[PDB]
Amino acid sequence: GAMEGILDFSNDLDIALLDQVVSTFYQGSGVQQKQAQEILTKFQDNPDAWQKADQILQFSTNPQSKFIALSILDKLITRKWKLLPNDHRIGIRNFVVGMIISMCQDDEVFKTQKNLINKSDLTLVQILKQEWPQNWPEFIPELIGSSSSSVNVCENNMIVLKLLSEEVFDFSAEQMTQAKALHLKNSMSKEFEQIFKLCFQVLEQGSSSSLIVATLESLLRYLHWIPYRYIYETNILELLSTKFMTSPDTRAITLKCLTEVSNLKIPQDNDLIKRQTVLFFQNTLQQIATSVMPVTADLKATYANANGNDQSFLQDLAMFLTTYLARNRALLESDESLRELLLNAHQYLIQLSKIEERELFKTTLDYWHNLVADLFYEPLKKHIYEEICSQLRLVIIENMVRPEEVLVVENDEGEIVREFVKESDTIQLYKSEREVLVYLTHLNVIDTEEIMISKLARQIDGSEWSWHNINTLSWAIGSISGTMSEDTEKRFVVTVIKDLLDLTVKKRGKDNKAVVASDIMYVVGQYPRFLKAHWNFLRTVILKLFEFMHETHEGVQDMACDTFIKIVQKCKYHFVIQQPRESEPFIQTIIRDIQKTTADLQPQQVHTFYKACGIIISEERSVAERNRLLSDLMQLPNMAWDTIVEQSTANPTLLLDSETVKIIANIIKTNVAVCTSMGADFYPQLGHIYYNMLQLYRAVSSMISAQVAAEGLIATKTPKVRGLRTIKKEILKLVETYISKARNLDDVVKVLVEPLLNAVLEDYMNNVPDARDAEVLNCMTTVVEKVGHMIPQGVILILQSVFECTLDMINKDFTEYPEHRVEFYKLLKVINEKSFAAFLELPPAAFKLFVDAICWAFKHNNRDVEVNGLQIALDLVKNIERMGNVPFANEFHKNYFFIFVSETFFVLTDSDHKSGFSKQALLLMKLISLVYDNKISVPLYQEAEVPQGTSNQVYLSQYLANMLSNAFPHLTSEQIASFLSALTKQYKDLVVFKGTLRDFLVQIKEVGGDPTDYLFAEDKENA
Amino acid sequence: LEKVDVKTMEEDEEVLYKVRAKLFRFDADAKEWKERGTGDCKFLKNKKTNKVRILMRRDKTLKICANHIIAPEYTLKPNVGSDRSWVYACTADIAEGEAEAFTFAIRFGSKENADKFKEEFEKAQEINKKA
Amino acid sequence: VPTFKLVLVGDGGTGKTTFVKRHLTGEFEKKYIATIGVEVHPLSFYTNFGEIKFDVWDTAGLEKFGGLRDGYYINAQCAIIMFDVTSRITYKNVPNWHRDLVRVCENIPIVLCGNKVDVKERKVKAKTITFHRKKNLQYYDISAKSNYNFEKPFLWLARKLAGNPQLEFVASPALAPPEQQYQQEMEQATALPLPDEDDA
């Protein structure tokens, strides 16, 4: 209705209506707000809307209308400014400068329309990016003179210069060509002496808190790039660290400025700059202790109360102290007069490390890591920090977070439950805490042992008992494994374990028993050195894990199986020998009792238990003994298998029996688990089941095919068919895991591969798309990777059976069958690396589909596919290059060289594939190099397309000039020719070549880009 | 802002049964299931009326994702995709405002939990019928 | 009761609209349909300080659909910048979103969220993620899919905006619910498989 009136540009713009459209969008709601939104987006996007901007700025009574007019002008200035007659260009600059002056003059508007003034200031800076200084040489001297005219104009000028510095130095890379960015940086550098004088004058003399704050904000940006003499040779560091730390309005920005200075690498032989760096740190800490809070203050409380800007200030202070000390604490460590300042600054960091805020704790911990690693390695330093280190031991011990192996956690209603999600953030924080604590413990193993043992006493006697407290102590105790002598560790671990054992005696109830069991398991898994030297202790520990496997808490049972694995990975030798005073190797006793030990476990935990037994067995290196152990371990699953095979061989309809399918899947998963720990040693068990297994794969396959035909593609989502497909998937995973690890590749080729190919490939090709398992391609990729070099004809079968029918599933869109798409390109990749000759046997129509499939991969946004795509293209080009000056190579270039060049230009240049930029460039450089290095033997053009014997060089350049001219018609022929002249000279130098592509990507977003920008590199080759 | 004590409106109910669950609603305008919430599903019996409702809340935000009487008329049916889920038609759910009809599916950790849910849902239907 | 404008920004595809919808209706939208310009959605939470309300301006991250772009940020009282930890280029763009945002909104609480931490092959690891530190932003690893930390950005914002760090999410009141034609919808709902039967 009426709101659409503003989209009619044949009529005058109605400002009062536009104002109402804008207020409907910002202040209204629901459907009206929605319609106003779509209208304003059309108005802003009209190619002519910039012509209304002056009118809106003059007459609008809505500051949002004016802000959007400025966005309109911003897009013109950034994209089309050069197309514009000098008439429009001067009038724009005049009315934007005029607007800013108006606003500065109106004290109430300057105070109340910050948003609009800051946006107007930004719009002025965009015009500076286009016209200054070559067409506005007076800008800076004038801005400096006009600053005395008015305290609002001076303040606003600081804003403009802050945004100018940002746009030229912090954000130019990737939004301006290299040449333009250099031009602007040079121009600001040449005028900076005048700007610093103004900025310094205001700081020594200025008055208005808001003017001082705007000046310091601009100073923060200049500190990113300006010459060091401005920082150290003026009196500015004394100002920042005294006067501006005292006043709260300037404190936050001052600390950020000093943090920028504090990260600077200083010239080491300059004793006066050293003294200056000491002095500003001295002043800054004195001001904090005087004006903000003394070293003793409880920053944990201050931070939790969150009054005013306290959290931000405590974050800025941690950043300032950790930045300066990581760079300069050596300046403070040798002079005895500075010792108190060194230790006070470390003491504020200790108080900051008590704050409950994970991100801030990680910032301080990263510094403590830097410090304690230096104390561990650097001579004569640890003694200075002894008292800081003591306090830090306590802070880390008390704030330990949950290791990843601890599978039990408190839910929101105070119950101890199995964790549903792994927490990568917390697992990382645990690892950084451990690294710091380990160094700390090496620095004073006596002090660490005393703190932990004394905390442990307060847990046992109940005085400090809580889940939190026993957890953080146990995690800390586990985390320092490896730091004590074997003697000290023995005494310490005996004490800890006896104490945790007596805790599981007091502390009844499901919750308490889960907590303490988690902590005993975590500690015991962390000390295999101790276990290995103490057989009676190791034996008792495993027996206690087997007890924990009967516990009704699933977290506890899960943790018991994982700790069993974790112990046997280190301790397996002691399970395989016969120990003194025992009648047999413990592994025999374990295998014998497996049914009893595991009766209360879920199937997944049982498979883990078998995997642990497999780790033990593979320690035994005589083949006969190891083989018998494997046979004894596999007794239960092999007996279940034999009967399941007899039975379901005699009654195929069992495979529809939910129960039978679950028994089969569990037997195969058990074999996967043992195969995963035994690897090459698993062969004799795989040999035992292999023939009947692949017959089962075939019977299950025919069931699936049948069910789908009888019930529809929806059958693939039913519990029956999903149970069947789980069986096939586990069979493929078993074979893959074995081949993955095999040492005898001859038996893989001569015994495993041919029955495998024959069971799997035809079945995959002949099922409907929804019933094909992507895991088939995954298994084939392992096969080709391990043994491809030995089965060139098998590789050809693989390709014939999966290639065209997979390509057909994934080449309609980018979304459907995401796993097949990923495995497909993995498999094509490994075949192209290892068995390139398979692709030479393809009939030409299929080879064409292969090139098509590579280009398709590279239009994906799915990272794993795109990356494989670009890599295959590179390797294919290399494979072709490697062949002779031969008909196949020559035909390849005649048919596909330009397909690859244009497809790679396409993804480089559209705005949808920015993540593949490096590999697109590498591919392009190699394609250019084939021509410029004279690697292609044959003319790439057709007979009578071009004069007598023209080079591939000049033909490539003509092909590209034409391609780019049609793809980017707004570019001049000159800009295209300069671009290409640069590229074709830079194709050996990745850094330069990519700067050239990036320049092109800037220029294609605008009109009238300067073609000389592509000679940027010819002048650092000059300079 | 001032601390506000205002409460759950479950204080005059007894918890007959509680189970962890994931709730879905059927979207007919698309041909699809949409998740509505994961959390504790509770059967709450009013101590005054002896009426039993299902009240389910999402973890963390504690927002309500099912709030309806367990009507005797309702029937739990299997979904073709699952051995651990029920589907049933609800005629008056107020989790999101005024009463609306839905087809819900509720899925559990295990077939054992789905089985106990059914037994308790039918127990509650009996309570509701005969009072 | 109080309403706060929240602007949600970040690269295309990082999970902005998915995360909002998850909070609005509980659903997990699997498809990617890029937002165009902005969509505005009211979202309320019940707290121990009463109900607090956000108008969530879920903005477009693809440049072709940017719409008014920074014009969306005017009057925002808080913000979430989102990236995806499975795509490095989305974290590389975070300083660009933050720059454009704080030029318009100089003094608001802002949460940085690294989404999709449920994905095995994580590309932007913990030690890379440090942008928030000098910029005083609150940072969470989150996953709209697994719900990992999915409530934390709003809880943190609510505490900042209410100026009360003891604010907590509480159970909303559960009013008593009230006392033939629907048989076809049951036929077909029972015949359509629930998603993620083997995730679950």
Ligand SMILES: Nc1nc2c(ncn2[C@@H]2O[C@H](COP(=O)(O)OP(=O)(O)OP(=O)(O)O)[C@@H](O)[C@H]2O)c(=O)[nH]1
């Ligand atoms: N694995 C995983 N996928 C997610 C997660 N969150 C979102 N997604 C998927 O990521 C895609 C992102 O979708 P959107 O939420 O529409 O993206 P967006 O950030 O709004 O994109 P624009 O609207 O273009 O700015 C969808 O396919 C989601 O299913 C997550 O936590 N984990």
Ligand SMILES: [Mg+2]
């Ligand atoms: Mg979106």
